[PDB]
Design a protein around this ligand. Structure first.
Ligand SMILES: Nc1ncnc2c1ncn2[C@@H]1O[C@@H]2COP(=O)(O)O[C@H]2[C@H]1O
Ligand SMILES: [Mg+2]
Ligand SMILES: [Zn+2]
Length: 330
């Protein structure tokens, strides 16, 4: 079932205090949690506290929840614990910069959803699971892994002393689970294209209405896409190192397909590394840029994410022109 953290782990987290220098840097969109590994769990506690309040969650349960969540992420190159905290931080920055647009319930729901959005990911895409008729694909027809992630999230909430949302009234509890369910399902990039087109149409015609729940859900879904893809909004060196991880996981999937007599797409073929630059260019133009463009239109304060994404697009074009540099990989 769900692995549970040790007492030394959650008890230790309770004693964590974010270093003063970081309190400032953590508020900016470009912040990279990368050089602070031992602090990731504590950084998440900190964001929840600043955004939701010191007493929003019983500290003990929060720390147990966080450490058990960390324990249930796998040792894969990309969809791991590091990614979870990175996505949660982007959400934190978005919420901080648009604080009163979102209810207390949605903020706590969204930060938790981001921390658990890829829970128990095994390193295999929906394409893989569905093409090899894996049990998960049978259980979950569409958004296969995303539905699994949500199921895992609730499972962890049900562990003894892990339910941070239990003090919520019966209706708010149901509400927060729905916010979390929709948010995590929104990370299925397949759904992003339609969501973005709908929001773009709503925004341009003037139909967009944040008081309209159906509209709210779409905005939140886009925010989720924005946070999931946030590596393209970090300083170039950071963006490049993360791209290496993204491909390490995709190539591993490609190697498995080969072993089973199925050739993988170029992107998952480690024998086609030369096409990465062009592949990323395609991704920014078809996905990232449109995403941050629409998000900025709806939530002006998120403007920095679009500016950063555009700067990285420019770096990939520079790579393609034959003006690359500094090649360091751990
Ligand atoms: N540089 C990139 N960063 C993030 N996602 C990427 C990138 N390039 C391609 N993608 C795709 O975008 C998807 C985002 O969600 P996933 O992690 O499920 O899978 C990712 C890949 O299929
Ligand atoms: Mg995912
Ligand atoms: Zn993710």
């Amino acid at each position: 079932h769900m692995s549970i953290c040790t007492s030394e782990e959650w008890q230790g987290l309770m004693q964590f205090t974010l270093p003063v220098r970081l309190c400032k840097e953590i508020e900016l969109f470009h912040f990279d949690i990368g050089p602070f590994e031992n602090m990731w769990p504590g950084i998440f506690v900190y964001m929840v506290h600043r955004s939701c309040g010191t007493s929003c969650f019983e500290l003990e349960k929060l720390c147990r929840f966080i450490m058990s969540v960390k324990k249930n992420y796998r040792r894969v190159p990309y969809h791991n614990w590091k990614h979870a905290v990175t996505v949660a931080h982007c959400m934190y920055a978005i919420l901080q910069n648009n604080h009163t647009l979102f209810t207390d319930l949605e903020r706590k729901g969204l930060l938790i959803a981001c921390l658990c959005h890829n829970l128990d990911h095994r390193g295999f895409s929906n394409s893989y699971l569905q093409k090899f008729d894996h049990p998960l694909a049978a259980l979950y027809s569409t958004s296969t892994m995303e539905q699994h992630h949500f199921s895992q999230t609730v499972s962890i909430l049900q562990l003894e002393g892990h339910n941070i949302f239990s003090t919520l009234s019966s209706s708010e509890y149901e509400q927060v689970l729905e916010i979390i369910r929709k948010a995590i399902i929104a990370t299925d990039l397949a759904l992003y294209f339609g969501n973005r087109k709908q929001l773009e149409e709503m925004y341009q015609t003037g139909s967009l209405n944040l008081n309209n729940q159906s509209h709210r859900d779409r905005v939140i879904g886009l925010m989720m896409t924005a946070c999931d893809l946030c590596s393209v909004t970090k300083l170039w060196p950071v963006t490049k190192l993360t791209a290496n991880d993204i491909y390490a996981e995709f190539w591993a999937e490609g190697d498995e397909m080969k072993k089973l007599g199925i050739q993988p797409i170029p992107m998952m073929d480690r024998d086609k590394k030369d096409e990465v630059p062009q592949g990323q260019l395609g991704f920014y133009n078809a996905v990232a840029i449109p995403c941050y463009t629409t998000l900025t239109q709806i939530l002006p304060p998120t403007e920095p994410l679009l500016k950063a994404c555009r700067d990285n697009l420019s770096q990939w074009e520079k790579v393609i022109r034959g003006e690359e540099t500094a090649t360091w990989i751990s």
